[PDB]
Amino acid sequence: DNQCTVQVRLELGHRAQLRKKPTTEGFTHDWMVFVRGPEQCDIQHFVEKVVFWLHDSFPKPRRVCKEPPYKVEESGYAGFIMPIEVHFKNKEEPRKVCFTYDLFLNLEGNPPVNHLRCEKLTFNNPTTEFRYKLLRAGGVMVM
Numbered sequence: 001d002n003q004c005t006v007q008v009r010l011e012l013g014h015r016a017q018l019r020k021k022p023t024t025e026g027f028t029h030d031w032m033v034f035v036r037g038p039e040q041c042d043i044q045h046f047v048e049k050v051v052f053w054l055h056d057s058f059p060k061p062r063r064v065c066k067e068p069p070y071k072v073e074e075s076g077y078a079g080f081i082m083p084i085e086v087h088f089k090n091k092e093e094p095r096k097v098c099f100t101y102d103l104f105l106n107l108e109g110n111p112p113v114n115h116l117r118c119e120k121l122t123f124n125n126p127t128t129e130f131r132y133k134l135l136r137a138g139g140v141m142v143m
């Protein structure tokens with residue numbers, strides 16, 4: 001009857017580089033973390049918001065992006081593990097997915113960091129409304 005699985009893809013990533021000169025605060029690095037879809041996909045169809053949970057050392061460390069670009073750009077002096085929550089426009093479970101993102105910086109001398117983490121999300125028997133949103137985003141029905 002109505003069994004199906006819908007797969008969508010998310011790309012998490014970050015860039016970091018050593019500043020030519022530290023900030024007055026002693027911030028050595030510029031970095032950027034993001035969540036995006038692959039080319040020609042619009043994840044905003046199924047994503048309500050992305051929450052980036054910065055290290056307690058940052059002011060207002062809960063950074064919300066309710067629309068693209070889903071990204072945080074900062075200057076700092078150390079990497080950390082960053083919880084990233086991708087909230088879905090889904091009425092039922094699952095409502096979100098959480099990733100533990102390793103935001104690492106390039107130690108002196110080393111080239112800039114430019115990392116990508118590809119995540120495939122499998123939704124089993126999504127609702128009609130949420131299935132609509134997944135497929136509008138470029139999601140694929142399996143079997």
Ligand SMILES: COc1ccc(CNC(=O)N2CCN(c3ccc(C(C)=O)cc3)CC2)cn1
Pocket residue numbers: 027055057058059075076077078079080
């Ligand atoms: C102990 O382990 C760790 C691990 C990782 C870090 C990284 N943290 C930073 O790089 N920074 C945190 C502090 N920074 C700010 C401080 C103050 C302001 C205000 C008041 O506007 C803005 C920014 C940004 C850079 C730190 N400690």
